C-alpha cells in the first residue's frame, strides 16, 4: 500500500543521512584533543547554603547580572534570593503548588513559573506597587510545563508534556509558532546566545534544533538510548550537551550534525538530571540522581571533580553568566552555591 | 545609602521569614494524597462522597485533620515523568474497578510500576477496590468467569482471616479476596516496613471512605514516627 513504500522511502532517507553523516567522520574529539594538558583535579566548596524551602527544589535560574537567583519548590513558592548576602528579596506564592520549571527574565524584571497546571504564570518582579503579582497567565498548552526560557522581555519559549514547544507573545498571550515533531514529551530546552536557534530534549531519545522565526526544525540529533532530562548550549553556539537516564551525557555539534563525545563511567549507573557548561566551555557540569554532581572535562571526557554534599537527588544546575559561581538545587530543599 | 539599603534588605528578609514560618506550620499540618485510577476505576464517586484546570484538587477534613487530594486528569497517559513529583505525598489512593476482569491486569501492572518505582518506593498505597456490588452481581450471574482471564482462581480458597458479609455468599467472598490477594502478592514482593498497602473493600454507596483514609494515614504516620522518633 501507500504506507509500506512511503516508509521504504523514509528508511532510504535515513540510510542516505547516515551515510552522509559517516562521511563527515574523520577523527574523534579524543584524537585531536589527546595532546592538551589535562585540567587537573579542581576543588569547589559550598560557599553559600541557601535555605528556606519547605519542600523539594525543582528548578533554579540565574539572572543577567550574576547576583539574583530564583528557585521553584513544590511547596508552592517561587522565592528569589540575593546570593551575595543570602537574603530573600521576594517570595511568590503560587496558585498551583506543582511547579517543574522557573525562568528569570534577561532584564531582571520578570519571572515565570509552570508545572502540572499546564499554565505558564508570569510575575511582575519590578512592579511600581512593589508587590509581586501574576501578570499574564499563559494558557493553551495541553500538558505539564517542563521548561520555560525568556527569549526577550516580551517573548517566551515553553516546552510541555504534549510533545510541543511554543513561542508566546506576552502582550496578548496567544501562541505565535507551535514547534511540533517530538514523539515523546519535551523535558528541557536551551536558547542559544544568538537567540535565533534553540535545542529541545524529549523522552524519545532525540534532540531537535528549532529556529524561532521560521517555526520549523532544522536538524535532528539521535545518539541517546533513553529519555532526555537536560540540555544546554555550548557558549559559542555551535554545540550542545545532553543528559539522559542512560547514565551518560553526550555532546553534539551542529554543523557536522553528529555526537562528539560521551561523558560516562561504569559506576555512574544513575541518570543525569541537569547539565550546564562553564563560560569558557572547558568544564561540563552535570547533575546526577545519586545525590551529587560531577564536573566533566568537555574536551578530555574525564571526571575532574565531584560537588558532593547534597542529601537527596540533584534536580537543577546553573552556572552564572560571568562564570564566577555554580549553583545546584536538590530535592533536600537546599540550594548551594559552589565556587 | 549602602548601609541604609543593607539594613533595608534585612527587614524584607525578616518579613519573608515570618510569613514562611506561618506557612511552614500550615504545610506540615496538611496531608497530601495522590489519587490514581483508570477511566472506569471510580475515582469520581469516592471523590464526590468525601468532597461533600488540569489537576483537580479536592479538600476534605476529618477529626480536625486537613487532607489534600489531587487528581491528575489534564495529562496524557504517559506518566513515567510527572509521577515523580509525588514522591513526598502521605499516601497514594489507588482505585481499581474489581468488576472488570479485562482492566484488572492493567491495574495490577500499574500497581507494580508504582510500587517498584525508585522515587515512590517509600509511599504507602491505600488500595480501594471499588464497585464491589457489580462484582457480586456478576459472580452470581455466572456469564463471565474469572477462570477465563485469571487462571489461578481455580486452585484457590478463601483465607481463614476473612470477614464475609451475612449476605455475601461464599463465591463473592472468594472472588473479592482473590482480587485482594492478587494485589497483595505484588505488595509483599518487595519493600520493608517503609512500604505497605492497606486494601479496602468499597462500593458506590459507601460513605465512610474518608474515615478509612484517616485511619490508614494515621497508621502510616505512626510507622514514620516509629522510624524517626527512634523506637524501631
Amino acid at each position, epitope marked *: 500500500s501507500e504506507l509500506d513504500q512511503l*516508509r521504504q522511502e523514509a528508511e532510504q532517507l535515513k540510510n542516505q543521512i547516515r551515510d552522509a553523516r559517516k562521511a563527515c567522520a574523520d577523527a574523534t574529539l579524543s584524537q585531536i584533543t589527546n595532546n592538551i594538558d589535562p585540567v587537573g583535579r579542581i576543588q569547589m566548596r559550598t560557599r553559600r547554603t541557601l535555605r528556606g524551602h519547605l519542600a523539594k527544589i525543582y528548578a533554579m535560574h540565574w539572572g543577567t547580572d550574576s547576583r539574583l537567583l530564583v528557585s521553584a519548590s513544590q511547596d508552592g513558592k517561587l522565592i528569589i534570593w540575593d546570593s551575595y548576602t543570602t537574603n530573600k528579596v521576594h517570595a511568590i506564592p503560587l496558585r498551583s503548588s506543582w511547579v517543574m520549571t522557573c525562568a528569570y527574565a534577561p532584564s531582571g524584571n520578570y519571572v515565570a513559573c509552570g508545572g502540572l497546571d499546564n499554565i505558564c504564570s508570569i510575575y511582575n518582579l519590578k512592579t511600581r506597587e512593589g508587590n509581586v503579582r501574576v501578570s499574564r497567565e499563559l494558557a493553551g498548552h495541553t500538558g505539564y510545563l517542563s521548561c520555560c526560557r525568556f527569549l526577550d522581555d516580551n517573548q517566551i519559549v515553553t516546552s510541555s508534556g504534549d*510533545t510541543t514547544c511554543a513561542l508566546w507573545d506576552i502582550e496578548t498571550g496567544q501562541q505565535t509558532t507551535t514547534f511540533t515533531g517530538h*514523539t*515523546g514529551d519535551v523535558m528541557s530546552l536551551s536558547l542559544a546566545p544568538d537567540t535565533r536557534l534553540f535545542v529541545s530534549g524529549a*523522552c*524519545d*531519545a*532525540s534532540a531537535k534544533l528549532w529556529d524561532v522565526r521560521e517555526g520549523m526544525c532544522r536538524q535532528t540529533f*539521535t*545518539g541517546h*538510548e*533513553s*529519555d532526555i532530562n537536560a540540555i544546554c548550549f555550548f557558549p559559542n553556539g555551535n554545540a550542545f550537551a545532553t543528559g539522559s*537516564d*542512560d*547514565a551518560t551525557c553526550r555532546l553534539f555539534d551542529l554543523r557536522a550534525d553528529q555526537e562528539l563525545m560521551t561523558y560516562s563511567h561504569d559506576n555512574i*549507573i544513575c*541518570g543525569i538530571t541537569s547539565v550546564s557548561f562553564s563560560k569558557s566551555g572547558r568544564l561540563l557540569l552535570a547533575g546526577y540522581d545519586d545525590f551529587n554532581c560531577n564536573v566533566w572535562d568537555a574536551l578530555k571526557a574525564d571526571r575532574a571533580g565531584v560537588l558532593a554534599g547534597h542529601d537527596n537527588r540533584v534536580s537543577c544546575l546553573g552556572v552564572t553568566d560571568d562564570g564566577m559561581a555554580v549553583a545546584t538545587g536538590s530535592w533536600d530543599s537546599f540550594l548551594k552555591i559552589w565556587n | 545609602d549602602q548601609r541604609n539599603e543593607e539594613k533595608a534588605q534585612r527587614e524584607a528578609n525578616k518579613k519573608i521569614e515570618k510569613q514562611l514560618q506561618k506557612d511552614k506550620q500550615v504545610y506540615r499540618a496538611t496531608h497530601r494524597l495522590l489519587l490514581l485510577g483508570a477511566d472506569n476505576s471510580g475515582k469520581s464517586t469516592i471523590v464526590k462522597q468525601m468532597r461533600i484546570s488540569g489537576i483537580f484538587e479536592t479538600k476534605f477534613q476529618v477529626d480536625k485533620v486537613n487532607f489534600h487530594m489531587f487528581d491528575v486528569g489534564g495529562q*496524557r*497517559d*504517559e*506518566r*513515567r515523568k510527572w*509521577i515523580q513529583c509525588f514522591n513526598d505525598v502521605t499516601a497514594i489512593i489507588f482505585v481499581v474497578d474489581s468488576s472488570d476482569y479485562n482492566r484488572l*491486569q*492493567e491495574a495490577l*501492572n500499574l500497581f*507494580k*510500576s*508504582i*510500587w*517498584n*518505582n*525508585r522515587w515512590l518506593r517509600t509511599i504507602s498505597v491505600i488500595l480501594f477496590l471499588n464497585k464491589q456490588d457489580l462484582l457480586a452481581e456478576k459472580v452470581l450471574a455466572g456469564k463471565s468467569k474469572i477462570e*477465563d*482471564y*485469571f*487462571p*489461578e482462581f481455580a486452585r484457590y480458597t478463601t483465607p481463614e482471616d476473612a470477614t464475609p458479609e451475612p449476605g455475601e455468599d461464599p463465591r463473592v467472598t472468594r472472588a473479592k479476596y482473590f482480587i485482594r490477594d492478587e494485589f497483595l502478592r505484588i505488595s509483599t514482593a*518487595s519493600g520493608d516496613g517503609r512500604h505497605y498497602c492497606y486494601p479496602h473493600f468499597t462500593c458506590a454507596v459507601d460513605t465512610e471512605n474518608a474515615r478509612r483514609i484517616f485511619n490508614d494515614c494515621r497508621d502510616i504516620i505512626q510507622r514514620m514516627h516509629l522510624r524517626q522518633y527512634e523506637l524501631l
Partner: nanobody
Amino acid sequence: QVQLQESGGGLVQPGGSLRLSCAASGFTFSNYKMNWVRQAPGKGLEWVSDISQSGASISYTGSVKGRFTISRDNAKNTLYLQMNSLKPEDTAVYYCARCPAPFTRDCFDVTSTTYAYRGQGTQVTVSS
C-alpha cells in the same frame, strides 16, 4: 538511534505455532527489561508478557499462561515470544516494547498510545 524491528507475523491455522522475533539495534541490550504488547482490532493496546534482564523474573498475562513463552538472547540483542496452540481470540498486532530506563524494575507507559521505544510491529492473524 533506538530501533526495534519485529518479525514472524503470519496467517496460521487455529492450533498451530509461529515464532515472533524482535531485532533490537540501537542501544545496550543486557541492561533493559523488555515486554510484549498486543492490540486486537477494535481494542486498545494490552499487556502480553514481560522478561527481566538475564532471563529471570518472567511474567505473563492471565489469558495466555502456559501457552506463551518468552526468551531473550543477549548475545544477539533479540527477544522471542513463542505462541503455541493459538485461539481465534489472539488476532492482534504484536509489539516489542521496551522499558523506558535501564537498571529499573518498574516499567511505565509500555502500553501507552504513543511510546518512544516500541517497534512498528508485525500483525498476527489466526483464522480457519
